[PDB]
């Protein structure tokens, strides 16, 4: 089969500037009737794949000219004149020239902003959770930029470890920031022995690491 | 407008056989190259299979061949995709999409997650994230629903059944250590609106037929 190697594998980009994106296949790609099959295709955070490009250079009906297709034989090239909000996301080359038809590996686009510090809500277990025999204490942080965060547990002021998981909303198609949330998992028993649980959370908007608590 | 609708997603363990379906609206159907694509999780799209406008050449990648079937029915406007015989590396989310040259795929459906896995199906367990003094930031209240132990994915997430979507951050699904998943919603309203306004989180676990409306309160 056709490999398709893209390159960059993450691309940074302020909004307003220009981006460039590289699609190198392992044979030619002309086919026999003289057209050359490559197709750009973007795909926005959990939404199906969308057509940007087609045959090299044509832009599908939907698609803005900001968008452009180049290259020949074996190499092609995407370029966003200017990089809007709503661009990011994982783009791949595909090539149909050949059966079966293949796809690039991807190439993340990733929005660079301005800083934004989270904000922090914590929330305790539910009475209704603990009536079956395991506690969940869950830590968010919405709206912040950039991704890295700390959130680290204290359970009496003592830092836990190996109880807790983090999931990480993918940058959004609006304003480009993410969210976050950290989960304490813990039997009744457990919780039900310590009285303070915090969240602290340390981020570059922060003005110092953020603590919130509740006493059970 | 164009629609492309699948169904029939869900789990099936390694060895067993799983039918997709296609319901296309808004084109000339019987006039359209048709094909099946899939995306692994984490990774990229790859070719599964494709059916020419009379039905007569069906083209398998390798993988699938001898397994799978791809069919039509232009008066119903639907695309098929008969799975047997299926392997764990076949899980992944199948798009169908109208093909009008060369692959450049221009109508794509929502997607039909097909999990290839042993494990069995669980209903997940819905608790509410009550708004309090300490889910308060400034004038704002996060609330939310905290979605436990299901098996396997996805599940959905609505707020008063759609009305609700400014502020709504629903997160990715974790894998926990049992090897079941969870997964939280939580929406940011006006502190001010508590104890006025109505929050119900809608949950949906189809392949457990899990419909769930819990009223989160403060
Ligand atoms: O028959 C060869 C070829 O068929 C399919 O690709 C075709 C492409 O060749 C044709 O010219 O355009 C249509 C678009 O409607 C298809 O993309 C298979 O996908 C391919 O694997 C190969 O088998
Ligand atoms: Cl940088
Ligand atoms: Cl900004
Ligand atoms: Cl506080
Ligand atoms: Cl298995
Ligand atoms: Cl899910
Ligand atoms: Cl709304
Ligand atoms: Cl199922």
């Known amino acids: 089969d056709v490999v398709m190697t893209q390159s960059p594998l993450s691309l940074p980009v302020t909004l307003g500037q220009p981006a460039s994106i590289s699609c190198r296949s392992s044979?030619?790609?002309?086919?026999?009737?003289?057209?050359?099959?490559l197709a750009w295709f973007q795909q926005r955070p959990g939404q199906s794949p969308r057509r940007l490009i087609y045959?090299?250079?044509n832009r599908d009906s939907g698609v803005p000219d900001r968008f452009s297709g180049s290259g020949s034989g074996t190499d092609f090239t995407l370029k966003i004149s200017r990089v809007e909000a709503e661009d990011v996301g994982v783009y791949y080359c595909?090539?149909?020239?050949?059966?079966?038809?293949?796809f690039g590996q991807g190439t993340n686009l990733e929005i660079k902003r301005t800083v934004a510090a989270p904000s922090v809500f914590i929330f305790p277990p539910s009475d209704e959770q603990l009536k079956s025999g395991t506690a969940s204490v869950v830590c968010l942080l919405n709206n912040f930029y950039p991704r890295e965060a700390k959130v680290q547990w204290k359970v009496d002021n003592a830092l836990q470890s190996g109880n807790s998981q983090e999931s990480v909303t993918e940058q959004d198609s609006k304003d480009s920031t993410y969210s976050l949330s950290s989960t304490l998992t813990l039997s009744k028993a457990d919780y039900e022995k310590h009285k303070v649980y915090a969240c602290e959370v340390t981020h570059q908007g922060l003005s110092s690491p953020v603590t919130k608590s509740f006493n059970r | 407008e164009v629609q492309l609708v699948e169904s029939g997603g869900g789990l099936v363990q390694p060895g067993g056989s799983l039918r997709l379906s296609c319901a296309a609206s808004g084109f000339i159907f019987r006039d359209s190259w048709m094909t099946w694509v899939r995306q692994a999780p984490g990774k990229g799209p790859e070719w599964v299979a494709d059916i020419n406008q009379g039905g007569s050449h069906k083209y398998y990648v390798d993988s699938v061949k001898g397994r799978f079937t791809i069919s039509r029915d232009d008066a119903k406007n639907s695309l098929y995709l008969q799975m047997n015989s299926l392997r764990a590396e076949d899980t992944a989310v199948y798009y169908c999409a109208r093909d009008p040259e060369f692959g450049a795929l221009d109508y794509w459906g929502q997607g039909a997650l097909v999990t290839v896995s042993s494990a069995s199906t669980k209903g997940p367990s819905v608790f509410p994230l009550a708004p309090s003094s300490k889910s308060t930031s400034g004038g704002t209240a996060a609330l939310g629903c905290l979605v436990k132990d299901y098996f396997p994915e996805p599940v959905t997430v609505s707020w008063n059944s759609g009305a609700l979507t400014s502020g709504v951050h629903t997160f990715p699904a974790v894998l926990q250590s049992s090897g079941l998943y969870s997964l939280s919603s939580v929406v940011t309203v006006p502190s001010s609106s508590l104890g006025t306004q109505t929050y119900i989180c809608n949950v949906n676990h189809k392949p457990s037929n899990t419909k769930v409306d819990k009223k989160v309160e403060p």
């Open positions: 044979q030619s790609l002309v086919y026999s009737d003289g057209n050359t099959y």
């Open positions: 595909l090539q149909g020239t050949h059966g079966p038809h293949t």
């Open positions: 045959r090299v250079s």
